[PDB]
Amino acid sequence: AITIGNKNDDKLTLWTTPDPSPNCRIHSDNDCKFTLVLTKCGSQVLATVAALAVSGDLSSMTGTVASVSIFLRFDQNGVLMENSSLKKHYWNFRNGNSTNANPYTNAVGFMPNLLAYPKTQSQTAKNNIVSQVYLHGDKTKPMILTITLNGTSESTETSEVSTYSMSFTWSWESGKYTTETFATNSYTFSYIAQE
Amino acid sequence: AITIGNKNDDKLTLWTTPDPSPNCRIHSDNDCKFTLVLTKCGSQVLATVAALAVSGDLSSMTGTVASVSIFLRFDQNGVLMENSSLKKHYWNFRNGNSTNANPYTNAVGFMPNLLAYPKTQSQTAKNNIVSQVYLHGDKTKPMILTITLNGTSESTETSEVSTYSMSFTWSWESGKYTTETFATNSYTFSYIAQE
Amino acid sequence: AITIGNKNDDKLTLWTTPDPSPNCRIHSDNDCKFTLVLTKCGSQVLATVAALAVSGDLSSMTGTVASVSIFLRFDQNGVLMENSSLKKHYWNFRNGNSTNANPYTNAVGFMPNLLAYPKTQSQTAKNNIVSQVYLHGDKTKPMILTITLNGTSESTETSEVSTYSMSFTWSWESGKYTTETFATNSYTFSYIAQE
Incomplete structure (x- = not known):
C-alpha cells in the first residue's frame, strides 16, 4: 500500500471545528454557524472561512446597514477575547474533526503580523483583503467581502483592548436581499503571521 | 552557499503533473489539458487549477448550456474513479516534474472533509467556492467559476457511487463566446481535508 | 501552557520583510513600498502581495497607460536580477520580522515552474492569475490584477536574460483614478514551484 497526504500536525491548525454548531452572533445569540480554519504555513496562515445564518433572513439580522460583520479579538497571547462574535468553547487546535480538550494558552503564531498590519483607526489598504463574492453562489447576488487584519478590527474599549x-x-x-438567508461560499485567504 | 526553499515532500503533493498532455474530457475524449495540483498543508489542501481546450472552440464542446464542467470522483480510499473527467494514468504523488511510477492506494488526506462539505443533492453554499474569473485573462470576457466539494459533485450512479x-x-x-477557445487562468483555492 | 502554531522554518520564507521601507520603482526610484511574502508549501508557493505608492498620485506615476506594473526577474539560481522593480537589499529568507544578514545563493524552490509556466512571448492563459481587485478597498474603484508567471514577464534584454x-x-x-494614491489590498495567490 502507498498512503499519501498522511502528515497533519494538529498544533498547526486552529479552527472552529469543520462543522460547527451555532457558535456565533451576527444580530442575536447563536444566530450563525461560523466556520474558520487557520493553518500555519511558516510565515503565513492559510485560511478558509464560511458563514451560515440559522435563525432567519437578512432583514431580521441587519439594522439600517446592508452588511454582516463577524469580528475576532485576541489578547497578547493570541487567546480569543469575550468581545468577539465567535464563542470560545470550540475554538482550539485540532483533535480529529473536533477540538483538543485542553484550551491553548498561546497562539501568537496564528495572529496577523502587527508590522504588516498595524493597529490603527485609519483604513490602511494593506490591512484589508477585498473580494467580490456571491450570496448562495448566485452570480446575480454579489456582495463584497472585506477581511480586516488588526487595524480597524481591533477593540479599543476600556478593559477589553485587543x-x-x-x-x-x-x-x-x-x-x-432582505428576504434572503445569509449563506456564504467557502473563501480562501492568507495573511502574514506575527511569528 | 545558502539554499532556501529546499524542502519538498513528494507525498504531500497529488497532481496531474505540472504540464499534462491531453488528459481530460469536456465534450470528447482528450479534448482538454487539465492541470490540478493539490498540496497538503495540515488540515487544508492548497490547490491550483487551470484548464486548456486542445480540440476546438466552445461551440464545439458545449451543447445548449453555456458552461464547461470537469468532475473528479474518488472512492473511500481517495482513489480516482472511472466516472471522472480526468484520466488516471498521470494522477499521482510527485516524482520531479512527473508522477511516481507506483500508484497511490490511499489519498484520504487530500479529500474534501465530509463534515465540512457533506454529500447532498442540495446546493449548500459552504460546499462551493465561487469567483469571477476571465476567459484568456480578458476583463471583457468574464466567467463564473464554481468549485463544488463533495455535495452535488458526488456520483450516485449505481455501482459507481463516490x-x-x-x-x-x-x-x-x-x-x-461560441468561437472562443476555452483557456483559463491559473486559480488558487483551499479546502478542509478529511484527515 | 499549550503553545500552538509554533513551527516556522525561516528558510521556507522568501520576503521583502513584512513592513518594507520604500523598496520599489513604479515610475521613479523608491516611489513604492512593495510587500511580497513567498512561503514554500511543497510543490506550491503560497504568496501574499501588497503595494503602496509613497511619492504622489497615479497621474504622477503613469504615462498614457492606465496601469502599474511591478516585475521581478531571477537568474538560473533564483537570485533577483538588477532589471527588477524591487531592490535586492531586503529580499531574502526570514530572520524575525527582517531578513537574514546573509544573502541566499539559491532559491529555485521558490521559482515558478518552467514546465507549468514556460518562457514565451505569447499570453498563455495558464501563466497568468487574473482577478478583480479594488483600489483602496473601494467597491466603486475596481482594477484588474494580472499576475504573470515566467512567460511574458521574462526579460530577454541582451546580457540580462532572466x-x-x-x-x-x-x-x-x-x-x-488620476488623482488617487495607488494603494492595494493584500492579495493571496499560489503557483507551482520549479522544485
Missing part, C-alpha cells in the same frame, strides 16, 4: 484581531464584513447594495 | 468528489464548473452568459 | 520571473500588473479603465 492586541490582535480580524474581522469579516460582507456588504451589499442598500435595499437588496 | 465517497469524495470535486467539480470545477465555468459558466457564462448564454450565447456568448 | 530564467524565472513574475510580474504584477494592475490595470483599470483609461482616464480614471
Whole structure:
C-alpha cells in the first residue's frame, strides 16, 4: 500500500471545528454557524472561512446597514477575547474533526503580523483583503467581502483592548436581499503571521 | 552557499503533473489539458487549477448550456474513479516534474472533509467556492467559476457511487463566446481535508 | 501552557520583510513600498502581495497607460536580477520580522515552474492569475490584477536574460483614478514551484 497526504500536525491548525454548531452572533445569540480554519504555513496562515445564518433572513439580522460583520479579538497571547462574535468553547487546535480538550494558552503564531498590519483607526489598504463574492453562489447576488487584519478590527474599549484581531464584513447594495438567508461560499485567504 | 526553499515532500503533493498532455474530457475524449495540483498543508489542501481546450472552440464542446464542467470522483480510499473527467494514468504523488511510477492506494488526506462539505443533492453554499474569473485573462470576457466539494459533485450512479468528489464548473452568459477557445487562468483555492 | 502554531522554518520564507521601507520603482526610484511574502508549501508557493505608492498620485506615476506594473526577474539560481522593480537589499529568507544578514545563493524552490509556466512571448492563459481587485478597498474603484508567471514577464534584454520571473500588473479603465494614491489590498495567490 502507498498512503499519501498522511502528515497533519494538529498544533498547526486552529479552527472552529469543520462543522460547527451555532457558535456565533451576527444580530442575536447563536444566530450563525461560523466556520474558520487557520493553518500555519511558516510565515503565513492559510485560511478558509464560511458563514451560515440559522435563525432567519437578512432583514431580521441587519439594522439600517446592508452588511454582516463577524469580528475576532485576541489578547497578547493570541487567546480569543469575550468581545468577539465567535464563542470560545470550540475554538482550539485540532483533535480529529473536533477540538483538543485542553484550551491553548498561546497562539501568537496564528495572529496577523502587527508590522504588516498595524493597529490603527485609519483604513490602511494593506490591512484589508477585498473580494467580490456571491450570496448562495448566485452570480446575480454579489456582495463584497472585506477581511480586516488588526487595524480597524481591533477593540479599543476600556478593559477589553485587543492586541490582535480580524474581522469579516460582507456588504451589499442598500435595499437588496432582505428576504434572503445569509449563506456564504467557502473563501480562501492568507495573511502574514506575527511569528 | 545558502539554499532556501529546499524542502519538498513528494507525498504531500497529488497532481496531474505540472504540464499534462491531453488528459481530460469536456465534450470528447482528450479534448482538454487539465492541470490540478493539490498540496497538503495540515488540515487544508492548497490547490491550483487551470484548464486548456486542445480540440476546438466552445461551440464545439458545449451543447445548449453555456458552461464547461470537469468532475473528479474518488472512492473511500481517495482513489480516482472511472466516472471522472480526468484520466488516471498521470494522477499521482510527485516524482520531479512527473508522477511516481507506483500508484497511490490511499489519498484520504487530500479529500474534501465530509463534515465540512457533506454529500447532498442540495446546493449548500459552504460546499462551493465561487469567483469571477476571465476567459484568456480578458476583463471583457468574464466567467463564473464554481468549485463544488463533495455535495452535488458526488456520483450516485449505481455501482459507481463516490465517497469524495470535486467539480470545477465555468459558466457564462448564454450565447456568448461560441468561437472562443476555452483557456483559463491559473486559480488558487483551499479546502478542509478529511484527515 | 499549550503553545500552538509554533513551527516556522525561516528558510521556507522568501520576503521583502513584512513592513518594507520604500523598496520599489513604479515610475521613479523608491516611489513604492512593495510587500511580497513567498512561503514554500511543497510543490506550491503560497504568496501574499501588497503595494503602496509613497511619492504622489497615479497621474504622477503613469504615462498614457492606465496601469502599474511591478516585475521581478531571477537568474538560473533564483537570485533577483538588477532589471527588477524591487531592490535586492531586503529580499531574502526570514530572520524575525527582517531578513537574514546573509544573502541566499539559491532559491529555485521558490521559482515558478518552467514546465507549468514556460518562457514565451505569447499570453498563455495558464501563466497568468487574473482577478478583480479594488483600489483602496473601494467597491466603486475596481482594477484588474494580472499576475504573470515566467512567460511574458521574462526579460530577454541582451546580457540580462532572466530564467524565472513574475510580474504584477494592475490595470483599470483609461482616464480614471488620476488623482488617487495607488494603494492595494493584500492579495493571496499560489503557483507551482520549479522544485
